[PDB]
Ligand binder design. Structure first.
Ligand SMILES: [Mg+2]
Ligand SMILES: [Mg+2]
Ligand SMILES: [Mg+2]
Ligand SMILES: [Mg+2]
Ligand SMILES: [Mg+2]
Ligand SMILES: [Mg+2]
Length: 1186
RNA sequence: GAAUUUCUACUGUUGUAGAUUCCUAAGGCGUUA
DNA sequence: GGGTAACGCCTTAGGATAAATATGCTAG
DNA sequence: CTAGCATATTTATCCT
């Protein structure tokens, strides 16, 4: 039943941001436009970006000025150096504790260097933008009045930089966070420095020197006590340019020195550069047409002042190549030779084989440019693999050149993209063809001897005119290829530095924002900053008139900060009058547990004082606080949690509609409507999930016991129109349906349907942060509870396995505790309550669509978005199956245990799918369940730990278990047979030794198949399982090769029994009587027979028989299971996988079953390990009795 | 040639079904012309 | 495969606040 | 000289 997840609700809190659209009401938009609140806020974005860049430059200079004067102790540096070189050993107390201690000491030294500088006192305050930044700009000579004006525009608006200052505070921190300077300089740069030191101390001390030592100080860069110099960005740059790789560097020297096999193999010791210091570093179609016409005129011209037409001049010059001497004409060694071989002979390797077999035999002295005469000589004798005895090549190179020059097509001479693209295609095809004869740069590995003047002198001047296409083609491909709509939105402030930062009643003349509600529609009023007291004094609240519902939001944000601040402030300390004992308790930190002076009595006394002060405070005693007895508090954390949980209430006050209308009309209030398509009068179906969250924020049931909290610091954005031309489906005209399974062929609408209507007009935005499970205990890691429940009670817990199939996008298999399969279904088609969608067909069609439209340069993209919008349906299906069938979910481990390629859902997409399922199961609601029923809106399931990173999650994420997908597809489902063989092919001796360890090779008189009896103990350094009996009945499909004709990736159904019979009979081997075949197979000789026998042996052991063209893909067993029956996926009994992709999901489910058995058996929970091993998995599948 | 806070599949009829945590900052890696 | 940055991913970090306090303006 | 008001800016710092 539902007992499994009934106790896994309300575990830890979550925070999410809901997005809406703001529709201005009445004269809101008119007044917004009149006061120019949109241009101002779009200019503020540019000003904010420029001032942030200026502050970044200021921080750059401060970092360069601070780290320059720091001097590390050095002895601690030597301690870190020796600890880093103490070998692997073990993670004992020393290797970890002293490592962390020295790292923290160095980091704190760097941070102390930061703090000592005078500029650090007011680096994150109003002083920075008021005085320090203008003074710093004035000091700089280059400066600029524009920069000073931009900074001065924020002289009374500094609070707008609070988030940026918080972002920039992370760099000057002690904690080991990636966004820090000390952390970088002690954890990332220094290990690279020591690695460079050790690779130098190895390679240089070896002394096989052939490079320049650069000695004829110098070596001080690599010695110790120099890490102080490379602390700044200038030092890092100096170290990198010394390393190098326009000044010669050590890395360049060593890379050039790795040749002649003296040190070439030792490429790993290559010097890695240090990491960079933190925070340190066409127009239109008319112009394109003009450039195209200019190049056309430059190409053809009008045949004036001699023939300047490059198209025919180059053709004539190439036709004249035969008359020119071939002893001085050079040819490129690049893929142009491959093209020449493919065109002249039809084989792309003839010329290269001639050059590597007849021209010379060492490393061939590889040169960039060969000579035409040498190629002619080589082609005159190329061993004539398969051709006429005498080949009429003549001047084969020149013959091919002139052939492609004129007789190839006789069509070289010639606004729409098609014509321009075809012309460009022909042009750079010709330029690629003529490129081999061009001399690249000068002094390219020698050669470049005295050239043919009469040919090459004209050729070099002719080719430069045609070489202008490459930059032209680059510009064309850069300009022509650039999405229909745009998602750039301007943030709106409404003249308030702190807007929407909080909803509290007291803090509403400062944030100038309220919520209103009427007839189930939620509005948002952002009052003008000039009149911010309009809501302070409501004239009346009579109920006869139609009334809005203004929200009375009250909150106590943080108890640990708010309580001492209010109760221990010079303004209020007299009112509350803390006793001397309480003041001493707070000062000495006795209440805190982190301090060594922890005292339960002091903490309880402070808690009692806080309770009394809260009772005294007028705005806080209205919260209706109800605390536990003070004697039950373990520490101050419990009291703070209680205050935070109970310090939040929402009430709705009634205000006249006429007052709001007058405020909107007069321009004092900007009234929007928080809108969603579920808020429309025509909406009738199930509302969106975020709409349910928003409406539950203010529900009476929710407000009785808060589950949803309205968080402050919201944002209002403005998105401009992005799509000018519209594709509109006119009204009263039938529209063809896009769903083939839909019975209704056409639909008629009495109104227009504009494509992407949300992007053709200006739309406001509203991002509302909300919190789920406000009063949650905080069990962020439910693994201990899930494991305890699974061990205690699991007679009815099923297992679900998800594997990305080769053909099927994703395959699902649900199994019991006994391994019996209940449900098998490929997730390629999702059958929801409506007609099913063939997502496999969609992706299959759209991949072809994208690859064919890429040449057309239509920026369709998609594919990714469809595959990332497909996985949402799969996540919904998985959640439904988990809730309905009481099953855990087991998946592939993509960190350690990932699979190969050639699956539809690649590793990158599968990681995102796993992340999406983890996120969904963090808070899992059903739009159909009751609000209070478990799994409903107010009692949501929480079946997964909060997601932080792919690496942080281990082998268990709550109810999701991760297993290595090693040996999950190519295993028999019935028995546990696995093909662990790695035969390969070698000489006769090793093959004969291999076949010598088979127990018994024989022919079965009955049923007409071979028996290959053996034991796994003879093969590989493993001792597991028992002796198997591999047969020759269940292996059909075989492929010849990977490419080319007469051998290809083409399936050929062949009976291995018949082929084995023919192979044995054709060398007079007798097997009719049924005798053991070990004799007469040791006859040796005829190695090809051994290759054939070994290929059949590999053939008779493959599990997955696949055909590329046809969809059939079946797994068929080579061994029987206690009844002389060989498994076959084709003739399955619905208790075994029906498909070659089903086997992976079934075996992942079985791995999860093994995980469940391990959890149940162990009595040492909260410490047990779940990472399965290959030996244990092999023993599990080969468990004899099931 | 298809409406959406936003995405995907739709017509499920001014919308249907299921995802949907947003803003800012820093760093690392990969394709290539 | 020799010392190129426009895109495309990944990692990490801060926040999702009311109230005390300092400062500018009116008034004197 | 100048008490009071209104606004902008900073601050208060649990424990797992
Ligand atoms: Mg303000
Ligand atoms: Mg709906
Ligand atoms: Mg798999
Ligand atoms: Mg498979
Ligand atoms: Mg929708
Ligand atoms: Mg769409």
């Amino acid at each position: 039943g539902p007992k499994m997840f009934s106790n896994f609700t309300n575990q830890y809190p979550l925070s999410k941001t809901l997005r809406f659209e703001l529709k201005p009401v009445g004269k809101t938009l008119e007044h917004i436009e009149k006061k120019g609140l949109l241009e101002q806020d779009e200019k503020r974005a540019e000003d904010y970006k420029k001032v942030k860049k200026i502050i970044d430059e200021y921080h750059k200079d401060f970092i360069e000025e601070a780290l320059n004067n720091v001097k590390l102790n050095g002895e601690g540096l030597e301690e870190y150096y020796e600890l880093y070189f103490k070998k692997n050993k073990d993670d004992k107390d020393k290797k970890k504790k002293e490592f962390e201690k020295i790292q923290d000491n160095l980091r704190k030294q760097i941070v102390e260097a930061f703090k000592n500088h005078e500029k650090y006192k007011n680096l994150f305050k109003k002083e920075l933008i008021k005085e320090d930044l203008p003074n710093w700009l004035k000091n700089s000579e280059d400066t600029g009045e524009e920069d000073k004006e931009t900074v001065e525009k924020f002289k009374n608006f500094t609070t707008y930089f609070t988030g940026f200052h918080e972002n920039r505070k992370n760099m000057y921190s002690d904690e080991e966070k990636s966004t820090a300077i000390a952390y970088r300089l002690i954890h990332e740069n220094l290990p690279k420095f020591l690695d460079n030191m050790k690779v130098f101390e190895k390679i240089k001390e070896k002394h096989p020197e052939a490079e320049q030592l650069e000695k004829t100080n110098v070596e001080d860069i690599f010695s110790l006590d120099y890490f102080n110099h490379t602390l700044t960005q200038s030092g890092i740059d100096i170290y990198n340019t010394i390393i190098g790789g326009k000044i010669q560097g050590l890395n360049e020297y060593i890379n050039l020195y790795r040749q002649k096999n003296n040190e070439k193999n030792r490429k790993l010791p290559k010097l890695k550069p240090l990491y960079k210091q933190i925070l340190s570093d066409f127009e239109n179609d008319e112009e394109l047409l003009e450039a195209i016409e200019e190049f056309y005129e430059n190409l053809n011209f009008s045949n004036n002042n001699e023939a300047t037409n490059v198209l025919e001049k180059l053709k004539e010059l190439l036709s004249n190549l035969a008359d020119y001497d071939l002893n001085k004409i050079y040819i490129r060694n690049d893929t142009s030779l491959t093209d020449i071989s493919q065109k002249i002979f039809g084989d792309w390797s003839v010329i290269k084989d001639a050059l590597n077999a007849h021209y010379d035999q060492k490393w061939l002295k590889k040169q960039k440019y060969f000579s035409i005469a040498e190629l002619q000589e080589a082609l005159d004798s190329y061993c004539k693999e398969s051709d006429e005895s005498k080949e009429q090549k003549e001047n084969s190179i020149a013959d091919y050149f002139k052939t492609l020059a004129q007789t190839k097509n006789e069509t070289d001479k010639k606004k729409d993209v098609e014509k321009i693209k075809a012309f460009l295609d022909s042009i750079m095809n010709l330029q690629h063809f003529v490129k081999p004869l061009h001399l690249v740069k000068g002094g390219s590995a020698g050669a470049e001897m005295e050239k043919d003047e009469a040919f090459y002198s004209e050729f070099e001047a002719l080719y430069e005119e045609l070489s202008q296409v490459i930059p032209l083609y680059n510009k064309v491909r850069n300009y022509l290829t650039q999405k229909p709509y745009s998602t750039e939105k301007i943030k709106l402030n409404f003249e308030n530095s702190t807007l929407l930062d909080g909803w509290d009643v007291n803090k509403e003349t400062d944030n100038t924002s309220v919520l209103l509600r009427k007839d189930g529609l939620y509005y948002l009023g952002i009052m003008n900053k000039k009149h911010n007291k309009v809501f302070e004094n409501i004239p009346e609240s009579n109920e006869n008139d139609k009334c809005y519902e203004k929200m009375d939001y009250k909150l106590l944000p943080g108890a640990n900060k708010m309580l001492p601040k209010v109760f221990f402030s010079n303004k209020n300390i007299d009112y509350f009058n803390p006793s001397a004992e309480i003041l001493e308790i707070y000062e000495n930190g006795t209440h805190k547990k982190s301090g060594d002076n922890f005292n339960l009595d002091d903490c309880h006394k402070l808690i009692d004082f806080f309770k009394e002060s809260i009772n005294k405070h007028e705005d806080w005693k209205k919260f209706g606080f109800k605390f536990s007895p003070t004697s039950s508090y373990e520490d101050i954390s419990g009291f703070y949690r209680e205050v935070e949980q109970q310090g939040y209430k929402i009430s709705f006050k009634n205000i006249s509609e006429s007052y709001i209308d007058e405020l909107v009309d007069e321009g004092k209030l900007y009234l929007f409507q928080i809108y969603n398509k579920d808020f429309s009068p025509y909406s009738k179906g199930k509302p969106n999930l975020h709409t349910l969250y928003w409406k539950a924020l203010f529900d009476e049931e929710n407000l009785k016991d808060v589950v949803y909290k309205l968080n402050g610091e919201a944002e209002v954005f403005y998105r401009k129109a992005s799509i000018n031309e519209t594709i509109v489906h006119k009204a009263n005209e039938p529209i063809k349906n896009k769903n083939p399974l839909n019975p209704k062929k056409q639909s008629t609408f009495e109104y227009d349907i504009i494509k992407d209507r949300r992007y053709t007009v200006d739309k406001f935005q509203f991002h509302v942060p909300i919190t789920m499970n406000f009063k949650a205990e905080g069990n962020s890691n439910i693994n201990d509870e899930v494991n305890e429940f699974l061990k205690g009670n699991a007679p009815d817990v099923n297992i679900i396995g998800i594997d990305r199939g080769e053909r099927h996008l994703l395959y699902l298999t649900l199994i019991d505790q006994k391994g019996k399969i209940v449900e098998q279904d490929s997730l390629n088609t999702i059958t929801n309550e409506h007609n099913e969608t063939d997502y496999h067909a969609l992706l299959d069609d759209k991949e072809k669509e994208r690859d064919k439209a890429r040449k057309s340069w239509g920026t369709i993209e998609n594919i990714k978005e469809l595959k990332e919008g497909y996985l949402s349906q799969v996540v919904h299906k998985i959640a439904k199956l988990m809730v309905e069938h009481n099953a855990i979910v087991v998946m592939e481990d993509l960190n350690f245990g990932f699979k190969r390629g050639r699956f539809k859902v690649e590793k990158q997409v599968y990681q995102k799918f796993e992340k999406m399922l983890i996120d969904k199961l963090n808070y899992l609601v059903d739009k159909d369940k009751e609000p209070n029923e478990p799994g409903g809106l107010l009692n949501a399931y929480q079946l997964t730990n909060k997601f932080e990173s792919f690496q942080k999650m281990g082998k268990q994420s709550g109810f999701l278990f991760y297993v290595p997908a090693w040996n999950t597809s190519k295993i028999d489902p019935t028995t546990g047979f696995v093909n662990l063989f790695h035969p390969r092919y070698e000489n006769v001796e090793k093959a004969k030794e291999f076949f010598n360890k088979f127990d018994s090779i024989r022919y079965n008189s009955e049923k007409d198949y071979f028996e290959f009896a053996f034991d796994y103990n003879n093969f590989t350094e493993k001792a597991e399982g028992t002796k198997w009996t591999v047969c020759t009945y269940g292996e059909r499909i075989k492929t010849y090769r990977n490419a080319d004709k007469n051998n290809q990736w083409d399936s050929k159904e062949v009976n291995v029994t018949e082929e084995f019979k023919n192979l044995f009979d054709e060398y007079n081997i007798d097997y009719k009587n049924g005798n053991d075949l070990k004799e007469a197979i040791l006859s040796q000789d005829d190695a090809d027979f051994f290759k054939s026998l070994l290929h059949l042996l590999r053939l008779t052991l493959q599990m997955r028989n696949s055909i590329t063209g046809t969809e059939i893909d079946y797994i068929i067993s080579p061994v029987a299971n206690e009844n002389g029956e060989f498994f076959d996926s084709r003739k399955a009994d619905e208790s075994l996988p029906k498909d070659a992709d089903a086997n992976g999901a079934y075996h992942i489910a079985r791995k999860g079953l093994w995980v469940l058995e391990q959890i149940k058996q162990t009595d040492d929970l909260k410490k047990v390990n779940l990472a399965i091993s290959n030996k244990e998995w092999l023993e599990f599948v080969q468990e004899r009795k099931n």
